[PDB]
Amino acid sequence: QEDVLAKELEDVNKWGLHVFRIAELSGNRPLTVIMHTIFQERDLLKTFKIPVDTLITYLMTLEDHYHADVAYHNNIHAADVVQSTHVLLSTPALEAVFTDLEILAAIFASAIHDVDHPGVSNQFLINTNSELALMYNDSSVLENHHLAVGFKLLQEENCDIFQNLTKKQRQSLRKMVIDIVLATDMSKHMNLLADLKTMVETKKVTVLLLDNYSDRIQVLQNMVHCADLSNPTKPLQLYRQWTDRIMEEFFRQGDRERERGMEISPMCDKHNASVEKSQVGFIDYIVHPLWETWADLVHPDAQDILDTLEDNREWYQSTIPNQVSEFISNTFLD
Ligand SMILES: O=C(O)Cc1ccc(Cc2cc(-c3cccc(Cl)c3)nc(C(F)(F)F)c2)cc1
Ligand SMILES: [Mg+2]
Ligand SMILES: [Zn+2]
Ligand SMILES: [Zn+2]
Numbered sequence: 173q174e175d176v177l178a179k180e181l182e183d184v185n186k187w188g189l190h191v192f193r194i195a196e197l198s199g200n201r202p203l204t205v206i207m208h209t210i211f212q213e214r215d216l217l218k219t220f221k222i223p224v225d226t227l228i229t230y231l232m233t234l235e236d237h238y239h240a241d242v243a244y245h246n247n248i249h250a251a252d253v254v255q256s257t258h259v260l261l262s263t264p265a266l267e268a269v270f271t272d273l274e275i276l277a278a279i280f281a282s283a284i285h286d287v288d289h290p291g292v293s294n295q296f297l298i299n300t301n302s303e304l305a306l307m308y309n310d311s312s313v314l315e316n317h318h319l320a321v322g323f324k325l326l327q328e329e330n331c332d333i334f335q336n337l338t339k340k341q342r343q344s345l346r347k348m349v350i351d352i353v354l355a356t357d358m359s360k361h362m363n364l365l366a367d368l369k370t371m372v373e374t375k376k377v378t379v380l381l382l383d384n385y386s387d388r389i390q391v392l393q394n395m396v397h398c399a400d401l402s403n404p405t406k407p408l409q410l411y412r413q414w415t416d417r418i419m420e421e422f423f424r425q426g427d428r429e430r431e432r433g434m435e436i437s438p439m440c441d442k443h444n445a446s447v448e449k450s451q452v453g454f455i456d457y458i459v460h461p462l463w464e465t466w467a468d469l470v471h472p473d474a475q476d477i478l479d480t481l482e483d484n485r486e487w488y489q490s491t492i493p494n495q496v497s498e499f500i501s502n503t504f505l506d
Pocket of ligand 2: 285286314356357
C-alpha cells in the first residue's frame with residue numbers, strides 16, 4: 173500500500189495530482205500526507221526547526237477537525253488547495269520573490285483555510301441566527317472561525333509547529349495567515365480581483381518585482397484564492413468529482429432549509445437544478461476572469477491552466493441536456 177502511495181506522491185509538483193486516489197491510499201489522510209511531503213520538498217522542517225513528530229501530530233489533529241461527512245469542504249479539499257498553492261508558488265515568474273516565512277504562511281493558510289466547515293454557507297449561518305454568526309457579528313463568519321480553530325489546535329499536546337520561530341516571525345506569520353484566510357471569503361472576490369488587475373496594470377519585471385508587504389500579501393491572497401477556485405482548471409476527471417461533491421453539499425443545505433420552512437437558496441434545490449449550465453456560468457462570470465488575470469500576472473506560466481479551463485468549459489456546455497445569477501450576486505459580491 174505504502175509503495176503505491178509513494179508513486180502517486182511523485183506528482184506533488186504537478187497540477188492535476190490525483191488527490192482522491194491519495195485520499196483512499198492514505199486511509200483518508202490526504203492533508204497530512206500532502207503537507208508532510210511538501211514540507212519535505214521545500215525543506216521547511218530544517219529551515220524552521222520543526223520537529224517531525226510535532227508536524228505529524230499537528231497535521232493529524234488539523235485533519236481530524238475537517239468534517240469527513242461534508243462532501244466538498246472537507247480534508248480532501250484542504251489537501252487540494254494546499255497542493256495547488258504549492259504549485260503556484262513555484263511558478264517561474266515568482267522565482268525567488270517570496271521569503272521562506274511567506275511560503276510557510278501561504279501553505280499553512282491553505283491547510284487551515286476551511287477547517288471545521290459545517291457544510292453550509294455564511295449566509296445560511298446568518299439567516300438562521302446560528303451561534304457562529306452571533307459570535308462573529310455576521311462578517312466573514314466561517315473564515316474567522318477557520319482561523320481561530322487552525323491556530324487553537326497549535327496548543328494541543330505536541331502540536332506547536334512554530335515553537336522555534338522567533339517572536340517576530342510568529343507575529344508576522346500570524347498576520348499573513350489571517351490576511352490570507354480572510355481573503356478566502358468569497359464575498360471579497362470582486363475586490364480582490366480589481367486589486368489583482370491593478371497590480372497587473374502596473375507590474376514591473378526583471379520575474380515579478382514586489383517592493384512592499386502590501387503588494388506581496390496581495391499576491392499571496394490572490395494565489396490562495398485562485399487555489400480555492402481551481403477545480404475547473406483541473407483535468408476533467410477531477411473537476412467532475414468536485415462538481416458532484418459541491419452539488420451534493422449544496423443540496424443537503426437546501427434540504428435543511430426545506431425542513432425549516434425557509435426559501436431554498438439558489439443552487440441548493442435538488443428538484444430544480446441545472447448542474448451543467450451552472451458550471452458554465454461559474455466559469456464565465458468568476459473562474460475565467462480570475463484565472464485570466466492570474467495568467468497575465470505570471471505570463472506565460474499559466475497558459476496550460478487557462479487552456480484546460482477553456483476545454484472544461486466546452487465540455488460542460490456540450491453536455492447541457494436566474495438561479496446562477498442570483499447565486500453569483502449573493503456569493504461573490506460584497
Ligand atoms: O463560499 C460560499 O459562499 C459558497 C461557495 C462558493 C464557491 C465554492 C466553490 C465551487 C463553486 C461551484 C459552483 C457551483 C454552481 C454554481 C456556481 Cl456559480 C459555482 N462549483 C465548484 C466546482 F468547481 F467544484 F464544481 C466549486 C463553493 C461554495
Ligand atoms: Mg472557505
Ligand atoms: Zn477538537
Ligand atoms: Zn475552500
